[PDB]
Amino acid sequence: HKSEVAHRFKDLGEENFKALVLIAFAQYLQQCPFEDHVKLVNEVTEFAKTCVADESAENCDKSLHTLFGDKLCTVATLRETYGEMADCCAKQEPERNECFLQHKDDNPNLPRLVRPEVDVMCTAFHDNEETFLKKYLYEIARRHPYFYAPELLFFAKRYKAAFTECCQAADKAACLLPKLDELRDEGKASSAKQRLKCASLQKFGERAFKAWAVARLSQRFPKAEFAEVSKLVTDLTKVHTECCHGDLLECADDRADLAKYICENQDSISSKLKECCEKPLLEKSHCIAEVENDEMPADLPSLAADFVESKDVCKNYAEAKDVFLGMFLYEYARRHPDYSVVLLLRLAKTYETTLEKCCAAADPHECYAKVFDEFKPLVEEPQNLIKQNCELFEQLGEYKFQNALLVRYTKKVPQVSTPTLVEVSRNLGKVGSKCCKHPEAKRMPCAEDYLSVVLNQLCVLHEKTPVSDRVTKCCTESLVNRRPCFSALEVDETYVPKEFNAETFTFHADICTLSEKERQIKKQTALVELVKHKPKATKEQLKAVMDDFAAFVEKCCKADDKETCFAEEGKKLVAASQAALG
Ligand SMILES: Cc1cn([C@H]2C[C@H](N=[N+]=[N-])[C@@H](CO)O2)c(=O)[nH]c1=O
Ligand SMILES: CCCCCCCCCCCCCC(=O)O
Ligand SMILES: CCCCCCCCCCCCCC(=O)O
Ligand SMILES: CCCCCCCCCCCCCC(=O)O
Ligand SMILES: CCCCCCCCCCCCCC(=O)O
Ligand SMILES: CCCCCCCCCCCCCC(=O)O
Ligand SMILES: CCCCCCCCCCCCCC(=O)O
Ligand SMILES: O=C(O)c1ccccc1O
Ligand SMILES: O=C(O)c1ccccc1O
């Protein structure tokens, strides 16, 4: 196009254009104030319309990266606020832009964003809506500089609905809060998920990623031919590779381009794309990536014709090991949407191992006639972890269930930070909440998604603050080994029980007047220091105590005179349990 800006403005819309320019500049100039940024958006939007009016207007033919950089090099305090980043302005565009990508801060030092009161929030949102969103949109961006922009916009649009609906309600907070937490968590997960995909692209390699996508894709579009999926795995790989490079616009077009190919090849890909394809440039990619799996053929043979029996298995496999193995994954995944992607790589890594062995045999066929046999236990184990856990969760409530997990893990690795356990057990604990709601069909996949972040997130904390060679192994190991590795952890025997401290176990009436969360976070934080002091406790010697506490509260919060009750009663509880747990 004669004018990069004229185009992006025209098919995004003025509204979407400004939100996107804001986030863009908010991720770079993270230290400037809101008024300052609003400055740019308006300076830029005014310039843009210039270009829409005349594609040949002054400076409209300049590239975005160029225009973007110029504006970046426009800030007066650039050199004294961003220091090095300012040295980027002394470079020619191709490098400049590249220098600006490197001089960005992943984790800045801004304070945590504090959720105001539903009243002041709803008020503010009402008074000056636009600013209310753009500002906090500004606030999210500057804290998550790498978070893909458009997606951040989708959360914005959502957050906006959260208010539109709830602020005009009766028991507002009862409507908004259990939406903000959902939107928060949800965005914290989206942030961790794209941060990992890239972490995966470097440590593990191009091949490994490709393996991943052939599976998730044929699992998604199971009616595509192998060649059609390969095309996509290839186009997709480019995408993540560039997007993981940082450049937003480069990343954006790769995504746009690909979605164009997919929409002009629906008949060749899925039938579930009518909708998504019918949307405007902004939604397509997003929409598609979220579309449901198409239904499979139904007649579909059995993977035994081409991978076990049939002559020339080794002949085919040896000609192009990967294309072959890819064809295994393809054929295997498409007949199993119910499978966790990583479980499919496990099966395939097996089959692989097998051929490298059996195709170097006297009578091959005989050597691997027993291969699909080795798949049942690999499949079973993860399936049976779900049963057991969801069964357990149908039994106890989410909370009562998050405490089983708490004790479970506190005994697995007592060394880990107490606050880290509560959090893990909680986040981990939720997972069963919104996965065990799905029937078998969607479960296992479900878990792999959430469990993947909850685990990486856990590794990172352990990365920065190592604490157990064991979680380092599980965290250092391969993706296919990660999750199972963790389920392998056994109760720690070498552990030496944390010596006692009544302060850690002493409770004041303030608990009576605490927000449920706080109350739970508080019961659980102790339940842990409890397992950490008296680890050799039976869920028997342990289900107790927890009960003498259940009413220990009812006995001091209902009381006319708390304060002291939480002292005289307290001494009695601690004492009763000092002995109970010999
Ligand atoms: C997994 C995932 C990726 N993405 C984006 C972010 C990634 N770039 N970065 N950073 C990009 C990789 O193709 O897709 C997304 O918007 N939502 C998601 O759930
Ligand atoms: C891109 C997101 C735009 C969302 C705008 C946020 C307005 C909501 C107020 C903050 C709510 C969550 C803050 C928090 O949970 O700490
Ligand atoms: C300084 C000017 C900045 C302009 C930024 C324009 C960003 C346009 C993003 C379009 C993203 C489409 C994403 C998609 O289709 O998945
Ligand atoms: C587009 C080419 C398709 C290639 C498919 C390659 C599949 C081979 C990977 C086998 C699984 C073990 C490799 C890994 O560690 O992820
Ligand atoms: C273990 C100290 C950190 C706590 C988490 C360790 C185990 C997390 C693995 C979760 C995977 C399976 C879920 C489960 O089996 O309960
Ligand atoms: C709150 C209870 C949550 C329990 C969820 C456990 C689900 C286990 C998922 C196992 C995934 C295995 C992945 C793999 O083997 O590659
Ligand atoms: C040394 C003995 C200390 C006694 C402290 C017990 C710890 C109690 C944790 C309570 C968990 C209960 C959850 C609930 O009450 O619903
Ligand atoms: O912190 C949030 O509330 C949030 C929301 C959406 C996306 C990323 C986020 O951090
Ligand atoms: O971004 C896409 O275009 C996409 C397409 C298919 C599957 C996952 C995806 O993220």
From Swiss-Prot:
Record PTM text? Glycated in diabetic patients. Phosphorylated by FAM20C in the extracellular medium.
What effect on the protein does mutating residue 534 to E have, as reported in its record? Answer: In Castel di Sangro
Q: Does the keyword Iron-sulfur apply?
A: no
Q: Does the keyword Secreted apply?
A: yes
Q: What is the effect of changing residue 175 to F?
A: In Hawkes bay
Residues the UniProt record annotates as site (Not glycated): 2, 18, 39, 62, 71, 91, 104, 134, 157, 172, 179, 188, 193, 203, 210, 238, 260, 272, 284, 357, 370, 387, 400, 412, 430, 434, 464, 473, 498, 517, 522, 536, 539, 555, 558, 562, 572
Annotated residues that bind Cu cation are located at 1
Paired cysteines (S-S): 51-60, 73-89, 88-99, 122-167, 166-175, 198-244, 243-251, 263-277, 276-287, 314-359, 358-367, 390-436, 435-446, 459-475, 474-485, 512-557, 556-565
Q: Where in the cell is it found?
A: Secreted
- SUPFAM superfamilies in UniProt: Serum albumin-like
Family statement: Belongs to the ALB/AFP/VDB family.
Known function: Binds water, Ca(2+), Na(+), K(+), fatty acids, hormones, bilirubin and drugs. Its main function is the regulation of the colloidal osmotic pressure of blood. Major zinc transporter in plasma, typically binds about 80% of all plasma zinc. Major calcium and magnesium transporter in plasma, binds approximately 45% of circulating calcium and magnesium in plasma. Potentially has more than two calcium-binding sites and might additionally bind calcium in a non-specific manner.
Q: What is this protein called?
A: Albumin
What is the protein's species of origin?
A: Homo sapiens (Human)
Q: Which gene encodes it?
A: ALB
